Amino acid sequence: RQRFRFGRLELKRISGRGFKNDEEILIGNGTIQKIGIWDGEEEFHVRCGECRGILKKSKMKLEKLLINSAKKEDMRDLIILCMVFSQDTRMFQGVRGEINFLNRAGQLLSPMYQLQRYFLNRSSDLFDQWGYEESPKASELHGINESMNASDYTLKGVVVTKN
């Protein structure tokens, strides 16, 4: 179980194993792109800057995201990166603008990496499309909104912890 990188996201496997299969994905801007889709339940230690976390996912779905309280810029980006990495259906739907999977030279670009670059710049569109749910009643767990503040409603699957 090695530490590996997905752009600004650092991961370290806790449990589970994923199997990748190329699938045609209809993303939000109406275009269809072939993307390697991971199948299986996986759990990771995740990090973005000073923000630590635990990510749980299945095939094209973020099951849960446990993050610590830290720098709000790092909390936000970690959530963004984990949403993209999870390959959640809501994340693909959040792509409203144009994404190029080829540069101007005609070279091949990584679809997943391009999605990261896109949503790091378009977080509001992602959060709105992602949806919200009731924050946990538990005292040791709090919800978090689009402004990275403690709220009665939280981003779906995302809870902040300060234990």
What is the contact surface with ligand GDP in residues (CB under 6 A)? 6, 18, 36, 38, 42, 85, 110-112
CA-to-CA dists, residue 22 to 16, 35, 138, 142, angstroms? 20, 5, 40, 37
Look up residue 35 and give its two tokens: 């993307």
**Which residue's Cβ has the minimum distance to ligand GDP?**
36
Spatial separation of the C-alpha atoms in residues 144 and 140, rounded to whole Å:
13
Look up residue 33 and give its two tokens: 């792109």
| Minimum CB distance to ligand GDP, residue 11 (Å) | 7
Nearer to ligand GDP, 85 or 132 (CB): 85
| Minimum CB distance to ligand GDP, residue 140 (Å) | 28
Q: What is the radius of gyration, based on Cα positions, of the chain?
A: 15
Nearer to ligand GDP, 108 or 138 (CB): 108
Look up residue 82 and give its two tokens: 């984990």
> Please, are residues 67 and 160 in contact by the beta-carbon 8 Å criterion?
yes
| Minimum CB distance to ligand GDP, residue 135 (Å) | 27
| Minimum CB distance to ligand GDP, residue 112 (Å) | 4
Nearer to ligand GDP, 51 or 115 (CB): 115
